[PDB]
Design a protein around this ligand. Sequence first.
Ligand SMILES: O=C(O)[C@H]1CS[C@@H](c2ccncc2)N1
Ligand SMILES: [Mg+2]
Length: 712
Amino acid sequence: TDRVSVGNLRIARVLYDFVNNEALPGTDIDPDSFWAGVDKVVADLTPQNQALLNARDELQAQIDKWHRRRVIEPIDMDAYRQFLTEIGYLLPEPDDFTITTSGVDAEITTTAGPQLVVPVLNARFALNAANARWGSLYDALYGTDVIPETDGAEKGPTYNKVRGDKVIAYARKFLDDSVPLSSGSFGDATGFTVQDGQLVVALPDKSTGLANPGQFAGYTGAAESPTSVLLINHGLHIEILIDPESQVGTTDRAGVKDVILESAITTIMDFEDSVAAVDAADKVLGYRNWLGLNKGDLAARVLNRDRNYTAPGGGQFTLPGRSLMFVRNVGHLMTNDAIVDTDGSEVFEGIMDALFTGLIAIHGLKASDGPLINSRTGSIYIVKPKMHGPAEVAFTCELFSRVEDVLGLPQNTMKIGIMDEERRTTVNLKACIKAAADRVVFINTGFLDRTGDEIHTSMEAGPMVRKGTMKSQPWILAYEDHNVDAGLAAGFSGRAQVGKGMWTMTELMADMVETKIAQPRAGASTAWVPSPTAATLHALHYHQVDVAAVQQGLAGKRRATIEQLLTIPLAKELAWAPDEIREEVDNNCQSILGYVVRWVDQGVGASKVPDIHDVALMEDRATLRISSQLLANWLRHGVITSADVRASLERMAPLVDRQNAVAYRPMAPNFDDSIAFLAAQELILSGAQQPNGYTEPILHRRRREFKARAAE
Ligand SMILES: O=C(O)[C@H]1CS[C@@H](c2ccncc2)N1
Ligand SMILES: [Mg+2]
């Protein structure tokens, strides 16, 4: 075949060559020694990996049975809790403790702000994200619906001056709210100057300084006629660009060209749910972009340099010009044929990701082409998705420890971001944090994945509420508060990120600005945004809310109970009319079809996908998990029939075809000839039997089938 023999392993040649020729050089790791370590690590840790996956199945089987032997009625929580305890699903909560994680960057320990997640397979999205640390507020305001597109202020072919003036006014108000002048409003300023190391803002009738002079960070150009002024508020920078000879400056009272906000402080380069990677060739494409980012030489457009400034008193300094990068590895479930053993068995993908993304991350720890690209404190930041409970966290930590050895890195170099997106983690969260107390740099929550696990876990209990309803259910609201509480009680404030979920509605920025503020108000030091534009707008929220103070106020509170976490989202008696049932079916079938068609046919794992009401959504694979589990749950409990599912699929497919009006090939009307349509159908009809409702086993198979057909 086309493989390389290393002990028990048969490595795909494309991968072997990539690692030898591109990833190993410059790391001073012995190539033979590295490969020996890969073989050694796979052999030692594969059996525990498999053991953990079987224990998931065993717990799920026992809960399915607990439900099936019970008839209607209200749950009875005390017995249900007792049962979860007896089977080892719910573990005892350990004594209070403080995380000890060290060598972590300021961007993570102290700075509160937006966090971007982008597919690592998309070199252009990755580059834009890396460069999104500093973003234009005027661009973000002019370009989105934050400034309403009403009469006179619509966006046209060229610059609309009514719209631009509303932009200017919006930004002036933000300045007044965030960096108050001792007297007057930024709205009336005529100029900015720096005298005696103090910012002087010229007004028509007088001059004035900042109410808090400490918020003056510095400037560029002459003190007496600066090109920009730099401010700071809640640890985030704001840059006022001054240029009377610009498109916009020429219309402005102080000649202000733009307001730049430090925006995406950190970015997660994703190998998991936003990318479709089903073989060695796909994984190498991903590893190669991760390498270019870390070497600082990726070009699809290039990576930004650091930003130079003059301190208030006259000296010089610099600020980071790039988002600090995490990588999200895949989780414990999937195997990938990038490496097989002598029996032909595929190796666990999570284990490989640990080895390869960690090897590659070494490059971001040293000089590019050219200070070093990423972590100056010596850490590698790995986000680990889809873990179930503290034994699985303990395993990932042991995995990172073994990889560190192989790579000659000091212990605990590899830091972990624990996603709280499975129920067994949620109800054992303190213990999960404790398992990683020397490695953890964040925890976070979300809607899509965790809800999928909620539905699957209690699949046998009865019919669940609609998808849109899930978002406001008692279990999920308790889930969110419980996550923050656990983090703060573990000492995360000043040490680690407490994060919340993605805003998926890419074009509804006015709505985002209005409602996403709830997240920092709830004490989240960070939350997920779908674009650099959204990062800039979400940065506004961190100027309005003092997250550090919020966290200090939540200190010691217990605002959710285990009971609340365990409140299954069962629908009540006769909750829906026939038309509401059909709408929900249509909604879920369209979300599956819309996503699956681009995934299976084009290997795209994220994009702006129009929903059934043609609202653009940027969701990852988790949208599949929830929609398919909901449909499967409704089929399981007689809410809908299989002919109902079929009819909806048949209706939604031509609608999706139209929404994709390119290399797109229509699903209709010959459905059984479309691999992606058959994939959509399978996810639903096999939903109940997929381990924890995971969609990867089916998706990866179908995509590999499509690729094989495409090679004939
Ligand atoms: O991990 C999760 O649960 C998901 C929920 S939305 C998703 C995502 C959406 C868009 N781009 C990247 C990632 N992250
Ligand atoms: Mg997820």
